[PDB]
Amino acid sequence: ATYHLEDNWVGSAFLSTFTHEAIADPTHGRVNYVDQATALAKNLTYASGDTLILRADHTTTLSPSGPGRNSVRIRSIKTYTTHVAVFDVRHMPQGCGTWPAAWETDEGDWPNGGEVDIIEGVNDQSPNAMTLHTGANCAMPASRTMTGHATNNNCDVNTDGNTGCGVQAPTANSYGPSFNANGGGWYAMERTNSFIKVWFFPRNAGNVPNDIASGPATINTDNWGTPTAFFPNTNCDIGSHFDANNIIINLTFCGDWAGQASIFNGAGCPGSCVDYVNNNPSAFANAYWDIASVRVYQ
C-alpha cells in the first residue's frame, strides 16, 4: 500500500519525541535503565547531527550488591496502529550478555495489545529474530511467502511459553557483529489489519528499495519485494490482537533470555552473565546503537 510520512526522527529529534523509561527491567536483566537527563549527563544517549547513539556504560566496574549496568530504553511518545516504521541502523549493540531490541508494544495491557519484535537477539548470536507475542488464538501457517525461516508458529504467550511466533532472518549480517562489520542496514515493518511484515536490507544491498534507503515522504510497499518475515492473518486476526503500540529501542543485559547459563555459555561467553557484565566494562564499548533515522508512515 501507499503511505505518507507521519514522523521523521533524526538526531536531536529523538529527545523530544521519545522518553527514556527509567523502569525496573521487565525482562529481569543486569541493567539500570536511566532517565533522559541521566542518560544525557552520562553520555549514554547522544543525539546530534544525523546520529543517535544509545549505549551501555563501558567504564564502571559494578558493585555486585548495587544496580545493574547503566543503559537506556527509549519509547516513542506517539502510538501507532496501521503504519510502516523504517529504521536506518549503522550499528547495534554487541558483546557477551547483550540483549538489544527494536520493537513495538502496548506495555499497559501486555500481551493483549500485542508485541512485534523487529530487531532482537542475544549474546551476539546471529541471525536476527522477528517475533509476535499476543494473547489467545493467534497462530501462523506452516508455509507463507517470506525469505526467513519460521521457528514457532503459535504467537499466544499463554500457550507457547512467551516464545511468541518467530521468524529467523536468512543471513548472518542481519544481526550482531556480522551486521556491525557490514555497516548495519535497514529494517522496515509494515502493520495492517491483515498482516505484519518485516524486511531487512543489508547496508551494501544492491536491491534495497529507494523508499526504504532514502526515506522520501511517500512510499509504496507494493514495490518492496518479498518480506523477510511475514505474519499473515490466516490463523490470527491481526487487528484484534494488536492495538495502538509505542516504538521501543533498548539494550538490556543477561535476564530471562540472554542470562540463561545454557544460552550465555552456549554462545561461548565465559562464567556467569551477571559476573561478566559487572566486571568487564571495557567489553561493552561496542554495546551501542548508532541510528541514522527512524521514520514512520501512515
Ligand X SMILES: *[C@@]1(O[C@@H]2[C@@H](O)[C@H](O)O[C@H](CO)[C@H]2O)O[C@H](CO)[C@@H](O)[C@H](O)[C@H]1O
Q: DSSP label at 46? A: E
Through-space distance between the first and last CA atoms of the chain, rounded to whole angstroms: 10
Question: Which residue lies nearer to ligand NAG by CB, 37 or 261?
Answer: 37
Could you give the residue ranges of the DSSP H alpha helices within 79-166? Answer: 157-160
Which of ligand NAG, ligand X, none sits in contact with 120, Cβ below 5 to 8 A by type?
A: ligand X
The only residue of 103, 175, 242, 264 in contact with ligand X, by rule CB under 6 A: 103
The only residue of 17, 27, 38, 79 in contact with ligand X, by rule CB under 6 A: 27
- Cα separations in angstroms, 252 against 73, 197, 229, 249: 8, 25, 24, 10
Sign of CA dihedral 109, 111, 113, 118: positive
Task: Read off the amino acid at residue 273.
Answer: C
Residue 124 interacts with ligand X (CB under 6 A): yes or no = no
Listed ranges 38-46, 105-113, 184-192, 210-218: which one lies at the site for ligand X (CB under 6 A): 105-113
Active site residue 107: no
The only residue of 5, 53, 172, 292 in contact with ligand NAG, by rule CB under 6 A: 53
What whole-number distance in Å separates Cα of residue 166 and Cα of residue 11? 31
What whole-number distance in Å separates Cα of residue 297 and Cα of residue 192? 12
Question: Which residue lies nearer to ligand NAG by CB, 18 or 201?
Answer: 18
Residue 211 interacts with ligand X (CB under 6 A): yes or no = no
Out of 21, 104, 115, 190, pick the active-site residue.
115
For residues 6 to 45, the per-residue mask of contacts with ligand NAG, x marking binding by CB under 6 A and - elsewhere, is: -------------------------------------x--
Q: What cell was used for 150?
A: 519460521
What whole-number distance in Å separates Cα of residue 13 and Cα of residue 16? 6
Closest to 8 measured CA to CA, from 72, 88, 74, 92: 88
What is the smallest separation between the CB atom of 206 and ligand X, expressed in angstroms?
31
Active site residue 120: yes
Which of ligand X, ligand NAG, none sits in contact with 46, Cβ below 5 to 8 A by type?
A: ligand NAG
Which of ligand X, ligand NAG, none sits in contact with 276, Cβ below 5 to 8 A by type?
A: none
Binding site for ligand NAG (CB under 6 A): 43, 46, 53
